[PDB]
Amino acid sequence: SISEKMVEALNRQINAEIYSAYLYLSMASYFDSIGLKGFSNWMRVQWQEELMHAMKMFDFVSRRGGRVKLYAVEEPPSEWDSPLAAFEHVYEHEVNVTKRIHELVEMAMQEKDFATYNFLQWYVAEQVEEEASALDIVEKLRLIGEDKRALLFLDKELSLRQ
Amino acid sequence: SISEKMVEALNRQINAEIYSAYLYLSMASYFDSIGLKGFSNWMRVQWQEELMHAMKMFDFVSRRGGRVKLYAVEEPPSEWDSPLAAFEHVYEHEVNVTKRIHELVEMAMQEKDFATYNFLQWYVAEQVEEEASALDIVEKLRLIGEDKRALLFLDKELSLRQ
Amino acid sequence: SISEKMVEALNRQINAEIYSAYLYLSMASYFDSIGLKGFSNWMRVQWQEELMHAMKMFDFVSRRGGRVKLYAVEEPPSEWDSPLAAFEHVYEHEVNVTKRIHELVEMAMQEKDFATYNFLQWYVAEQVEEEASALDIVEKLRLIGEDKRALLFLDKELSLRQ
Amino acid sequence: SISEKMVEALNRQINAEIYSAYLYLSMASYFDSIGLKGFSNWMRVQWQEELMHAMKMFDFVSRRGGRVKLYAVEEPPSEWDSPLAAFEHVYEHEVNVTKRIHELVEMAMQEKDFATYNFLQWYVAEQVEEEASALDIVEKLRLIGEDKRALLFLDKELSLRQ
Amino acid sequence: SISEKMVEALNRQINAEIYSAYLYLSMASYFDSIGLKGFSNWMRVQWQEELMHAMKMFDFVSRRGGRVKLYAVEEPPSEWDSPLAAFEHVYEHEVNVTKRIHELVEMAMQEKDFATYNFLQWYVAEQVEEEASALDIVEKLRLIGEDKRALLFLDKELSLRQ
Amino acid sequence: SISEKMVEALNRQINAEIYSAYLYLSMASYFDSIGLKGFSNWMRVQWQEELMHAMKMFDFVSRRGGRVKLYAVEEPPSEWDSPLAAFEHVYEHEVNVTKRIHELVEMAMQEKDFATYNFLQWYVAEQVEEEASALDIVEKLRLIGEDKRALLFLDKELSLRQ
Amino acid sequence: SISEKMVEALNRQINAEIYSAYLYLSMASYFDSIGLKGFSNWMRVQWQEELMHAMKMFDFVSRRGGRVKLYAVEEPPSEWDSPLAAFEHVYEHEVNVTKRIHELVEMAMQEKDFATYNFLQWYVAEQVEEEASALDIVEKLRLIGEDKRALLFLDKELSLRQ
Amino acid sequence: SISEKMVEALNRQINAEIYSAYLYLSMASYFDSIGLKGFSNWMRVQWQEELMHAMKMFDFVSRRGGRVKLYAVEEPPSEWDSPLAAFEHVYEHEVNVTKRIHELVEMAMQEKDFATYNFLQWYVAEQVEEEASALDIVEKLRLIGEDKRALLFLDKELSLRQ
């Protein structure tokens, strides 16, 4: 059920998801110095929604009859050129997360892990809506522009997240 | 009245608190293969008690007229020779985390920053309770030994933490 | 046991807070000819939130064994070309309202009067958020413009102040 | 204390309220031809609240020992170049109805009729609250312009009137 | 869509329905000077029950994609030889209100408006019922007279209506 | 409307009522230095009863067609020759403010401004209890003396004020 | 960690706080033999309100990783020339209780205990407030005397305290 | 995630499921002319249970980052020879629906869509019970016959569907 090739790559998926949480938190400073409370709520909620997906894999790997591993969290970006970018950079660090599981899926069908195939369907179904909730934000600064009539209505429309 | 140095030493105590969540999370997993269900509850809680000391400085950084900074969370140790050795390491990682901020306290009685002294007092009032959660547990691993029949009454007595 | 020196610099901050409540009430008249009902309420709330910080010091002086003194509330500006000038003068009068107490900390940390210091402990934790309600108010007026299309979505969000 | 002239000049104020109700209910059509559903709603409540002030004065005249009298309601305008210009004509013909009462206050203070002096007091104190909802709205419609970006948030916030 | 031929005969039915309500408020003054207090409740309720059949039609044409027009509310009559004649006098301006809708059934196959047969059906089914509360009251005030044996229990018996 | 000749007489009573409210917060001190808790309680509540009638006139001035202005309102005394002087100055500045307003009352009936007459009756009905709530405190304080059996029963019996 | 220098001055503050409570139980006997029953409720409540500031400190040093020490609770005084002197006599052993903590602020940068400035802050903020319920009672029992005109309503007025 | 081969075949699965809903509705006319209320309820419930499965694919395809397409609804059958046939024709248009998804499943594993594989499990699990709820109806007219003692008990047993 466990391969040291598959046991090392699951601890590798956790540092990038913890990093994406350390990277969304860098847009809350970009939102608190610039003046955005929607990105601060979309980041204070995403800094706790991605780190809870990394505790779901330490409690799912620590049940297969093996030992878990803490890996290396790389340094993430801090700044971004616009509000369209935090939706596109969240949509870049998104597609970097779906192929990372789709490559481990065939790396589960080649390493003989049909138990992690059904275990990644909940990781393959959330990582499809997380890119539309960002694309809807990227196709919205484009659906807005450089205006600021919705910046008073987008900051307020993003504070109801939990 | 503002120095670009203390936000990084506060980000270094925040990096040590960012590290302690990956270091307690690596002490919750080595015990789940060993046979602790309590260390997972006290450490996933210490994995969540460490993320709360670095966010009070990220909400204080977004209020003094400044920016926070993201660094590298290094990989931490994973294993220990026993459950008792990680208990002796908690009496090492206690004053070493308080002095790094207490150095900012003495860097506050010399640099005139009365905003970080009362703000670390809540880190100095918790790091008397955070340091107390180790001595009463260590003076219990010495009262047991290398047996583990009374260690099974600690797993049930440490699973009620949240 | 009791010093009449810490009481006069507090009688200047209590009177300066009575003016800062009386000078913010003069920004409620400045907002009704242009067309703002929100900039008056963030002022109609601080006209009642600042007078409680000067009455919290008249009830701490009449319990420390002393007497308070009534001073002169000076005249403030009345008209402005915009909402940023009433916002930028408050971010100058912030550290300028903070220094009058930061001077009271040093006449208490050297003269041994921890009754006005702990009373000044409550003034150093609010004056980090009170500048954020000014930095967040100015860093929105600088990011908006003279586009009175976004000044109207803040008025509804500023008529909600209490 | 009863004159058939002061009761008939008051019964003429009911026709002026019938026109001000027929001219304000005719400004809701000015919103259905232009494209406003809020301006139809902010006027339909005042056109029926002013006609509610015209049915309440027929019982104060039918209490002085007399009969009321119905006169002629003139025809009003239908279309307009804007809502602020129709508000500025509304901020003139409103107080112009208050002076019409300012004519009845002295025509009661000269004939010893303390029953007709106080009877105009709930309308002369009310005709002080009716004018700021036009002056603050026109000096805001003047603060907006022809951009039509803030006018769609004024229609919805004014359709909640009852 | 909309033809300006049906809209002018509709503003005349709206003006005639505003009149049938404008004719009853003067039958409360003819009754409050004569000595009836029931007709003051019965006409002021009827002054608001008739404006509801034209407000169901003044709010229905300005929603069909057309414009309404405000006309002149004329001055009404004041006196009557008795209370019974004014009950039959409501029966002359009544069939004239039943006739205002009966012309549109034949005016719908020529103006191409198959919507006005069913829209005038609530006024052609009601304005035959509004007359039975008048014909049975007129054939009851007339079977009595100008007497005072049956008239004091009929005036009050209409004051519990709303 | 409102004229700045008459609008200056409304902003002048506000400074005397704000002083009398700032003098009452300073007449709370003549009892708080001695050791009385009711006369201190009778002042923090009366300091808000003049500010509750003068803040309704700052929101009545920004809607009546004028501008308000904050100038410099002078302070007041700290000490008194007796306990009666902080109470007799309250019984002197009371009817004299009704007269100070009685000079302004005729300045509304002289400019044909029935808009300030109904608004000053609320200023003429409040300044009739303000002379009874002080004269009744002085005409009771004269019957005791310098004793402390009824001066201590007035301190506890006045702590029930809100 | 823990130094035996701060723990001995703390068992003296614990013994001095056990004494300030041990000194009040003998002021209930001096009052129950004299003829006061209010001081029996006011001292037995004060005998348990003072043991709560040292039990907040006797349970705080034996949790910091150290040892407490039990000393001798001495015999206390019994008599007084009046009830007012024993109210001022509580004001001599008081500043001696306010002084027991003021030495640790300067004893924290030398014994390396930045925890005792904030831990003595609840006793340095309270033992100035415990004196206002004593100074205002002493400047009230002394402005009266050994008389019986103001003393019978003050003894009972402290018996509703807990 | 989206292929124009797979983007066209998903809009092709919707017209046949909308057609099966237009085809079950043709057995309600066959049930309303013949005399069946069980097939009318099994068709009025299935005409709304299959069209809700076609809105689940327009809201699942309009989230993959593409555009949806409305296709061609073919004409369906209207009549059937018996009640065993509407269970067998529903069981013919059933098996025409399971292979249609099982062919697109390998047309998802050849077009690289492992996100539509988990998305079709809810379409592959319902389309297995829909053939037993029809087969149980086909093996029931065979378990009945041409009798009509259960036609009074089958029409009634099919009206509790929602």
What's the rounded Cα separation, in Å, for the pair H110 and E157? 85
- CATH classification for the domain delimited by C1-162, as one of 3.40.50.300, 3.90.1150.10, 1.20.1260.10, 1.20.120.1770: 1.20.1260.10
Return the structure tokens found at G3: 């130094």
Q: Of G25, G30, G77, whose CA–CA distance to G51 is shortest?
A: G25
What's the rounded Cα separation, in Å, for the pair A135 and H66? 12
Q: How far is CA E162 from CA E26, E44, E54, F98, G111, in A?
A: 18, 9, 18, 48, 86
Measured between CA atoms, the residue of chain G closest to residue F37 is G136
Is D49 annotated as ligand-binding?
Answer: yes
Q: If 0-12 CB within 10 Å is exposed, 13-18 middle and 19+ buried, where does residue F80 land?
A: middle
A73 SS3 class:
strand
The residues pairing with B73 across neighbouring beta strands, listed in sequence order, are: A73
Is G146 annotated as ligand-binding?
Answer: no
Q: Of E77, E48, E65, whose CA–CA distance to E2 is shortest?
A: E65
Q: Which of B109, B125, B135 sits opposite G118 (nearest CB)?
A: B125
The beta strand positions in G18-154, using DSSP E, are none
Sorted by sequence, the CB contacts under 8 Å of residue F1 that are 6+ apart come out as D95, F64, F65, F115
What's the rounded Cα separation, in Å, for the pair G3 and G66? 8
What's the rounded Cα separation, in Å, for the pair A137 and E65? 37
- Residues of chain B with C-beta less than 8 angstroms from the C-beta of G64: 128, 131-132
Q: Which of C65, C115, C118 sits opposite G135 (nearest CB)?
A: C65
DSSP state of B68: -
Q: How far is CA A136 from CA A31, A61, F52, H63, in A?
A: 19, 34, 50, 10
What's the rounded Cα separation, in Å, for the pair A25 and A135? 19
> Which residue shows structure tokens 């995403």?
A46
Q: How far is CA H53 from CA H18, H73, H120, in A?
A: 9, 15, 12
Return the structure tokens found at C65: 């064994």
Instruction: Pinpoint the alpha helices (H) of A36-94.
Output: 38-44, 85-88
Contact present, B and E (at least 3 Cβ pairs less than 8 Å): no
What's the rounded Cα separation, in Å, for the pair G150 and G140? 9
Is H129 annotated as ligand-binding?
Answer: yes
Instruction: Pinpoint the alpha helices (H) of H6-145.
Output: 6-24, 29-32, 38-44, 85-88, 95-105, 132-141
CA distance A16 to chain B (A): 12
CA distance C72 to chain F (A): 6
What's the rounded Cα separation, in Å, for the pair G55 and G17? 9
Return the structure tokens found at H129: 């019970």
- Residues of chain C with C-beta less than 8 angstroms from the C-beta of G125: 114-115, 118
What's the rounded Cα separation, in Å, for the pair F105 and F116? 8
Reported resolution, Å = 3.1
Q: Which of A105, A121, A132 sits opposite H63 (nearest CB)?
A: A132
What's the rounded Cα separation, in Å, for the pair B35 and A67? 12
Q: Which of A34, A151, A153 sits opposite C139 (nearest CB)?
A: A34
Return the structure tokens found at H40: 């009318």
Q: Can you say which residues of C are annotated as belonging to the binding site for Mg(2+)?
A: 17, 50, 94, 130
Question: With the CA atoms of F39, F44, F50 and F53 taken in that order, what torsion angle do they form, in degrees rounded to the nearest 10?
Answer: -140
Supply the DSSP string of D56-106, one letter for each residue. Answer: SSSSSSTTSS---------------S-SSHHHHSTTTTTTTTTHHHHHHHT
Q: How far is CA C59 from CA A128, C2, F160, in A?
A: 59, 16, 18
Helix F13-22, helix F95-102: angle, nearest 10: 170
DSSP state of B73: B
Counting one residue from chain A and one from chain H, the pairs whose CB atoms sit within 8 A come to 17
Across the interface, whether the CB atoms of C32 and D142 are under 8 A apart is answered no
DSSP state of E2: -
Q: If 0-12 CB within 10 Å is exposed, 13-18 middle and 19+ buried, where does residue E148 land?
A: exposed
First to last CA, chain F: 36
Supply the DSSP string of E71-125, one letter for each residue. Answer: ----------SSTTHHHHGGGTSSHHHHHHHHTTTTTSTTTT-TTHHHHSHHHHT
CB H5 within 8 A of CB H107: yes
CA distance F155 to chain C (A): 16
Q: What method did the depositors use to determine the structure?
A: X-ray
Specify the amino acid at residue C121: Q
Q: Of C46, C59, C60, whose CA–CA distance to C18 is shortest?
A: C46
CB C44 within 8 A of CB C97: no
Q: Of A122, A119, A103, whose CA–CA distance to A111 is shortest?
A: A103
- Residues of chain C with C-beta less than 8 angstroms from the C-beta of D145: 148
- Residues of chain C with C-beta less than 8 angstroms from the C-beta of D149: 149
Taking the alpha carbons of E18, E19, E21, E26 in that order, is the dihedral positive or negative?
positive
CA distance C147 to chain D (A): 8
CB A14 within 8 A of CB A80: no
CA angle F23, F25, F28 (to 5 degrees): 105
What's the rounded Cα separation, in Å, for the pair F27 and F45? 12
What's the rounded Cα separation, in Å, for the pair G76 and G74? 6
Q: How far is CA B57 from CA A51, B15, B61, B69, in A?
A: 19, 11, 6, 11
Q: How far, in whole angstroms, is CA G60 from its chain's centroid?
A: 18
CB H88 within 8 A of CB H134: yes
- Residues of chain B with C-beta less than 8 angstroms from the C-beta of C129: 63
Interface residues of chain B, partner chain A, Cβ below 8 Å? 18, 22-23, 25-26, 28-30, 32-33, 40, 44, 47, 51, 58, 61-63, 66-76, 78
Measured between CA atoms, the residue of chain B closest to residue G120 is B125
> Which residue shows structure tokens 């009711």?
F38
CA distance C33 to chain B (A): 32
CA angle D53, D54, D57 (to 5 degrees): 90
Is H94 annotated as ligand-binding?
Answer: yes
CB E59 within 8 A of CB E106: no
Q: Of B25, B40, B54, whose CA–CA distance to A51 is shortest?
A: B25
Supply the DSSP string of C112-156, one letter for each residue. Answer: T-HHHHSSSSSSTTTTTTTTHHHHHHHHHHHHH-S-TTTSSSSSS
- φ, ψ for residue H135, nearest 5 deg: -70, -30
What's the rounded Cα separation, in Å, for the pair F7 and F57? 11
CB C73 within 8 A of CB C15: yes
Q: If 0-12 CB within 10 Å is exposed, 13-18 middle and 19+ buried, where does residue F67 land?
A: middle
Q: What is the CA radius of gyration of chain C?
A: 17
Q: Which of G95, G128, G138, G139 to mutate to test the interface with C (most CBs of C within 10 A)?
A: G128
Measured between CA atoms, the residue of chain F closest to residue C26 is F70
- φ, ψ for residue E15, nearest 5 deg: -80, -25
CB C148 within 8 A of CB D149: no
What's the rounded Cα separation, in Å, for the pair F113 and F98? 19
What's the rounded Cα separation, in Å, for the pair D131 and D140? 14
What's the rounded Cα separation, in Å, for the pair D116 and D64? 9
Q: Of A35, A60, D31, G66, whose CA–CA distance to B29 is shortest?
A: A60
Discontinuities after residues in chain E (C–N over 2.5 A):
none
D126 SS3 class:
coil
> For chain F, what is the largest distance between any 2 Cα atoms, rounded to a whole number of angstroms?
55
CA distance C145 to chain B (A): 21
Question: With the CA atoms of C56, C57, C62 and C67 taken in that order, what torsion angle do they form, in degrees rounded to the nearest 10?
Answer: -150
- Residues of chain A with C-beta less than 8 angstroms from the C-beta of H65: 131-132, 135
Supply the DSSP string of chain F, one letter for each residue. Answer: ---TTTSTTTSSHHHHHHHHHHTTTTSSHHHHTTT-SSTTHHHHTTSSSSTTTSSSSSSSSTTTT------------S--SSSSHHHHSTTTTTHHHHHHHHTTSTTTTTTT-TTTTSSSHHHHTTTTTTTHHHHHHHHHHTTT-S-SSSSSTTTSTTTT--
Q: Which of D26, D40, D68 sits opposite E70 (nearest CB)?
A: D26
Q: How far, in whole angstroms, is CA B15 from its chain's centroid?
A: 11
Q: How far is CA H159 from CA A75, H36, H37, H143, H156, in A?
A: 63, 11, 8, 20, 6
Helix G11-22, helix G95-102: angle, nearest 10: 170
Across the interface, whether the CB atoms of D143 and C33 are under 8 A apart is answered no
The residues pairing with A73 across neighbouring beta strands, listed in sequence order, are: B73
Q: Of C94, C88, C105, whose CA–CA distance to C127 is shortest?
A: C94
- Domain ranges for chain A: 1-162
Measured between CA atoms, the residue of chain G closest to residue B133 is G63
Q: Which of G102, G125, G129 sits opposite C112 (nearest CB)?
A: G102
Across the interface, whether the CB atoms of G65 and B131 are under 8 A apart is answered yes
What's the rounded Cα separation, in Å, for the pair G17 and G22? 8
- Residues of chain H with C-beta less than 8 angstroms from the C-beta of A125: 115, 118
